[PDB]
Structures are given as C-alpha cells and as structure tokens.
C-alpha cells in the first residue's frame, strides 16, 4: 500500500539522516572540551555540541521533500521553532537505558530537573517505542514541517507538506511494522511531538534565564544566540 512516492520519501529521509548524523562523533574533538569535577563548567562543551547539531538539523531539513518549496522566511520560522525538539529527538539515538552525558552534566550547563526529568522520561518513552529508523526520520521531518509554529505565513502549504509525510508514516506503519509493536504507534509518535512542545517551552524558559547573564551568554556560540535567541 506504500506508494512509489512514499518509498522515495523514505529513502530520501534515511539518506538525509545518514548524511547529517555521524554516530562516530568524529567531530566532537573540535568542540570546547567537557569539564567535569554557579560553575557551568559544561556550558562551553554542550553549547558547541548543540551549535553543531543545529547545523546538522538544518542540513537534514533542507532535504525533506517539499521543504525547498517554502519561502526562506517560513523555512527560518520552522527551523528556529523546531531546532531544540529535533535535537532532543535525534539524541534518542545516543540515549541509553567523555561524550556520554548524564544528569549532572546537563545541570552543569545551567539547566534544572524541571527540564531534565521530563527530558529523561521522554527519552525512555521514545526508546520504548523501538522505532524503525524509517519511523524515526519521518518523525523528525514531521516535527520540522509543523504548520502551527508561531510566525508561519503559508501554513496551508506547510500543512500540505506535512500531510504528505504523515500519510507516509501512517502507511509505513500499517505495511511494514508488525503488531504488537505497531499498536497505536502513530498516535504514540504524535504524543511524543506533543511532549516535545512542552520540553521546548521549558528549555526556552531556562535558556532565557541562563543567557540573560552576559557572562553565560559569552560562552554560547553565535549560531545558538541567533537561533535560540539573544
């Protein structure tokens, strides 16, 4: 029931992901180093990791079928509002139940359990879905092309692009994901997108607080300041 166009969409998103997610971390050596022992000793390293990852999320987004047909303005609004959520999603691939990060490390970048507890709970629940890589990359793409992001102009078009991806995901689940694993799986994936909105909001609140201090803002990168705010 998966059409030729749906198979094509999935192949494009798998490759896009492979081209932008290096599971060897060969690039992490170029970040400011993690420091472990208001210290914020992990802020330089994690700011560089996040800045790097925003670059990768952008590379992935550019390859989402249809994303190129949006105006540069709408592409901007969609990336700024989704970047932290796609970083959280894509990090599920390194999450497990110098470059392994624990709760203390995130604390040492200026964040609190108000963010970190729900974030770990999200990563556990996502891991339990045991998604196929096809599903994982469709979910990141659906997250990016969300018509309800504030500031979207041509929402109809964004919606149309997202529907094509949502329909692909739903058909993929029916055709390629065997029960019991597949039971309510689409609704569960959409619930994760809802969970990400709440995480986005709490991250934004803590980010505004930590970056309000110029000494911490100094430790971020130019891209992080531009995307997450300054």
């Amino acid at each position: 029931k998966l059409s030729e166009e749906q198979q094509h969409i999935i192949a494009i998103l798998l490759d896009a992901h492979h081209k932008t997610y290096d599971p060897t971390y060969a690039d992490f050596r170029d970040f400011r180093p993690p420091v472990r022992m208001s210290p914020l000793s992990m802020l330089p390293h994690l700011a560089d990791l996040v800045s790097y990852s925003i670059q990768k999320v952008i590379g992935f987004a550019k390859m989402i079928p249809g994303f190129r047909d949006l105006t540069s303005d709408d592409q901007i609004v969609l990336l700024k509002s989704s970047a932290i959520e796609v970083i959280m999603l894509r990090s599920n691939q390194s999450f497990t139940m110098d470059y392994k990060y624990d709760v203390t490390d995130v604390s040492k970048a200026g964040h609190t359990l108000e963010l970190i507890e729900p974030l770990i709970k999200f990563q556990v629940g996502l891991k339990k879905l045991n998604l196929h890589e096809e599903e994982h990359v469709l979910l990141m793409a659906i997250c990016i092309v969300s018509p309800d992001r504030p500031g979207v102009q041509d929402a109809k078009l964004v919606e149309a692009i997202q529907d094509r991806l949502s329909n692909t995901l739903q058909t993929y689940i029916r055709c390629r994901h065997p029960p019991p694993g597949s039971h309510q799986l689409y609704a569960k994936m959409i619930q994760k997108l809802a969970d990400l909105r709440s995480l986005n909001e709490e991250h934004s609140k803590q980010y505004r607080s930590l970056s309000f201090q110029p000494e911490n803002s100094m430790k971020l990168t130019p891209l992080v300041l531009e995307v997450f705010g300054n």
Binding site: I58, K62, S72, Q75, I76, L79, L223, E226, V227
Partner: peptide
C-alpha cells in the same frame, strides 16, 4: 531580528 547565519545555511 535578522537571521543571517540561519539564512546562509538554508542556502
């Protein structure tokens, strides 16, 4: 605000 870096990466 402007987003010159994001604009440049989006090509």
């Amino acid at each position: 605000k402007n987003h010159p870096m994001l604009m440049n990466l989006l090509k």
